Amino acid sequence: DNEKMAALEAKICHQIEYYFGDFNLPRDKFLKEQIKLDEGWVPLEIMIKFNRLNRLTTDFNVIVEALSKSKAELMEISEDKTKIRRSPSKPLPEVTDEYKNDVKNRSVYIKGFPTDATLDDIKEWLEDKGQVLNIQMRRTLHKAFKGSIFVVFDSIESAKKFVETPGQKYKETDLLILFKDDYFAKK
RNA sequence: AUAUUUU
Numbered sequence: 712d713n714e715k716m717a718a719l720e721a722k723i724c725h726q727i728e729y730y731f732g733d734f735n736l737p738r739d740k741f742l743k744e745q746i747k748l749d750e751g752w753v754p755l756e757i758m759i760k761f762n763r764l765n766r767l768t769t770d771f772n773v774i775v776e777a778l779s780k781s782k783a784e785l786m787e788i789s790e791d792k793t794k795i796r797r798s799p800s801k802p803l804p805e806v807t808d809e810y811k812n813d814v815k816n817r818s819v820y821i822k823g824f825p826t827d828a829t830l831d832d833i834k835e836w837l838e839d840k841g842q843v844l845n846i847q848m849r850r851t852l853h854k855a856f857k858g859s860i861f862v863v864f865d866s867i868e869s870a871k872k873f874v875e876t877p878g879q880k881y882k883e884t885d886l887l888i889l890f891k892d893d894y895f896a897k898k
Numbered sequence: 899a900u901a902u903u904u905u
Contacts, residue, residue, distance in 0.1 A: 729904065741905045762903050830904060846904075 719767060720777035726764050727778065728785050731797040733804060734845040734863060751796035752789060814863065817870045820894035822859040823886035833860060836881055841869035861891055 729735055730742060737743075745753045755771045758764060768774060775792050787798045804810060824833065830848060837843050842865035849857045864870040870890070879886045889897075 726904075735904075739903095739905070741900075741902060744900090745905095757905095760903085761905055763905090765903095834904095848904090 720773070720780060723764065723767050723774055723777035724781040724783065724786075726761075726767060727758070727774075727795070728781070728783050730761060730764075731785060732844070736797070737803060737806070746796070749794070751787075751799065752794040753796060754794045756793075758795065813867065815892055816867045816890075817864045818891035819862045819864065819870055819874055820859065820889045820891045821862060821886060822888075823884055824856075824858045824860065824881055825884070826856050826858055828856070828858075828881075837862065840873050840876075840879075841865070 730739070735742075742753075745757060755774060758774070759769045759771075764774075771793075775788055775795075778786050778788055778795060785797060785801055786795050788795050830846060833846055833848070834843075837846070843862055844865055845861075845863040847861040849859045849861070851857065864873065874888055874890055876888075879888060
């Protein structure tokens, strides 16, 4: 049972580390604004408004507990424990031609998921194919899931491996997997 | 409707 508490805390850490991570932060208008207010610090009162974290827990003490154990050590907790921020010692990487070129080469296109599949279904299916840093579910202008996604792996090596494996299926349904740039070339 | 939500 104590195991479940560890699991919840590992998920809380992962979710918050995603919001403040290299992939999401540079594209997060709302969050980039909060960060400019009090030297990076964002009150837990605000953090609780984040749906995904909300679903995990809205309790400040749990969140702080979870973060204080994080292995990533990306986040910093204030003394009064009412706010958190990305460590000033882990600044965002400079987005150079090279950085972007590397990102594109680590991005994959996958088609074949059912329209009702959720980010959680997809995340679970992916925890066995390499370290994923971002999952983008492709939706219509009105937010309807198209069944296709873009995935960004931790490195071009893990992405290459994944794209190389031919017999992949989701809940025993065939899947079309290509490198993201290759997908655009065809389309 | 910045009432932005993997905010």
